[PDB]
Design a protein around this ligand. Structure first.
Ligand code: NDP
Ligand code: MTX
Ligand code: CA
Length: 162
């Protein structure tokens, strides 16, 4: 099955100028790693270029990058369509789609699960997560956490299934 995972600040904002528009929340990164470890991850080229080299390729995961153009990094698998991205995952229990905006828009109609981090921050953005709440998603997990010394905004992890 196909799953999307995303951090959304207020009004579904997920990015600004190819970066996330809040300071790093290490607890959200630890949630991301927990949920994506040992699964293939599919990402657009802008998202691959936004991950610091210190954690690239994402370890313990098969990294699959969408680009219409030839690949520029032999360390990961490059693919030129959605169908090619899915094929490279192989027969596994769950495929994780990790962004960005144009990638999420294409995969949301195919997904049976969403892993969302809701961040209590009103920030400016140029990229939003697609409208999902109107469809037939039901929440099956949620967990709120207050801001602390290592995370400067409060956040709420959520899993929804179709
Ligand atoms: N808050 C969060 O959880 C996350 C936020 N983000 C943010 O999202 C933003 C990036 O999103 P966005 O600009 O939409 O970019 P994406 O990461 O979705 O990358 C889009 C690129 O991927 C390639 N691509 C997408 N679809 C196809 C396709 N069907 N066939 C071939 N190639 C395809 C294209 O590359 P090419 O141009 O080479 O053809 C396209 O330009 C950034 O701000 C980033 O920080 C990203 C991930 C998570
Ligand atoms: C910019 N980017 C995309 C990104 C960031 N936060 C997200 N958060 C959520 N919830 N979902 C996403 N898809 C998401 N994507 C990144 C940036 C860094 C790392 C990264 O360093 N990740 C380590 C996390 C370990 C760590 O905390 O350093 C990993 O192994 O996953 C991942 C994604
Ligand atoms: Ca590296």
């Amino acid at each position: 099955m196909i799953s999307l995972i995303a951090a959304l600040a207020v009004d579904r904002v997920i990015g600004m100028e190819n970066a996330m528009p809040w300071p790093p929340l290490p607890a959200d990164l630890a949630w991301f790693k927990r949920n994506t470890l040992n699964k293939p991850v599919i990402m657009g080229r802008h998202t691959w270029e936004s991950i610091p080299e210190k954690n690239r390729p994402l370890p313990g995961r098969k990294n699959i990058i969408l680009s219409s153009q030839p690949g520029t990094d032999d360390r990961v698998t490059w693919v030129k369509s959605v169908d090619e991205a899915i094929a490279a995952c192989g027969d596994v229990p769950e495929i994780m789609v990790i962004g960005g905006g144009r990638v999420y828009e294409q995969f949301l109609p195919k997904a049976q699960k969403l892993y969302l981090t809701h961040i209590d921050a009103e920030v400016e953005g140029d990229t939003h997560f697609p409208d999902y709440e109107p469809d037939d998603w039901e929440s099956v997990f949620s967990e709120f956490h207050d801001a602390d010394a290592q995370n400067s905004h409060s956040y709420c992890f959520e899993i929804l299934e179709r």
